[PDB]
Structure formats: structure tokens, C-alpha cells
Amino acid sequence: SQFERGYTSPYFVTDPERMICEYENCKILLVDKKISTARDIITILESAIRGNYPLLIMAEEVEQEALATLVVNKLRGTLKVVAIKAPGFGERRSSYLEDIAILTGGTVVRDEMGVSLEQATDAVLGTAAKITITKERTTVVGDGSTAADVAARVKQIRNLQMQTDQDYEREKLQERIARLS
């Protein structure tokens, strides 16, 4: 699972010489809307701190206010956190976030559909064996806990492949299968 979104602040790096952020046994917050302030996700941040978990946040955007709070807490050593923009745009962005939720055992937090952001708990968090974030790219390695779910999602993407005969879209779908494989 690799795609072309990088860290939203260079202060999130863990290796300043290489300019990369690397964490193991990392919690994953997937949000299909924007995060405007840290108040929006304070319950989630508290949970990550209570469990001493690194946290990767993927959102439509993490706005300036929230980003500044995350950076100050990271610099102080309070929070091991990194934020990226969710990959893609529109419906594709939503599809990719759901792929990553399935890989990591997380739950996409949506606008209106399901639990809202301010009332989301740590139950929505996915978990990854390893994440590596560079200036331009994100890699998520799953921890193998969702093998059946990922298998089913791959078959589902193949059925979507059968429901389109536009080659370009068949190809984007095959790339999603590769990223889940």
C-alpha cells in the first residue's frame, strides 16, 4: 500500500537526515472530510497517548490550526503523530480511504454517514505493522489481522472491474488490487 501523498508538515519526520517519518505498530485515523482543529479529534489523540501509540492521520485536509497543535505536541514529545492528505479526489478519495480502512481494520469517519468526527472514539482506529512517510509518498504495511476482509475487498474490486468496460477505470481498479496485495 503505497501512494503519492507525503507529510503535511516536515516537523513530523522522525529521521531528519533522510526526511522521513517511520513508525511501527501504528494506529491509523481515516477521515473522509477535513479536520479543522485538534478539539475535533481530542478523544482519539488521548487514546493514542494513553496507549503510547504512534498515530497516522489521513484526512481530506488537516487545517492550519489543527496542524499547529499536532506539531507542537510532536515537538514536545507528547504525541508521536504524522498527518497526510488522503490520496486522490472525490469518489476516488472515498474509495481509497475505504481500501485502507479494510487493510488496517479501521473505520472511515464520514460527513453524516455513520459516526461523526467529534464523537468518534478509538474504535475507529486501524493498526499497521509499519508506516513510512516521505515528502511525497506514504507506505502502509498491514499487520495481517484483516486477511479475510482484504481478500473480500480484492474480489469486490474485481467485480467492479466487471461492471465497467472503460479500460482506464479497469486499470485504476487493478492498481487498487495491487496495493491491497
Q: What is the DSSP string of 37-85?
A: -GGGGHHHHHHHHHTT--EEEEEEEE-HHHHHHHHHHHHHTS--EEEEE
Domain count, the chain: 1
Within 10 angstroms of residue 147's Cβ, the number of other Cβ atoms is: 9
CATH of the domain at 112: 3.50.7.10
SS3 content of the chain, % helix, strand, coil (to 5): 45, 25, 30
Full residue range of the structural domain in which residue 159 is found: 1-181
**Euclidean distance between CA atoms 84 and 136, whole angstroms:** 10
- Owner of C-alpha cell 514536545: 76
Experimental approach taken: X-ray
Residue 65 C-beta-side C-alpha neighbours within 13 Å: 8
Q: Can you tell me whether residue 120 is helix, strand or coil?
A: coil
Within 10 angstroms of residue 178's Cβ, the number of other Cβ atoms is: 10
| Sign (positive or negative) of CA dihedral 34, 40, 45, 50 | negative
Resolution in A: 1.5
Host H or E run for residue 160? helix 147-163
**Euclidean distance between CA atoms 136 and 150, whole angstroms:** 26
**Euclidean distance between CA atoms 166 and 146, whole angstroms:** 30
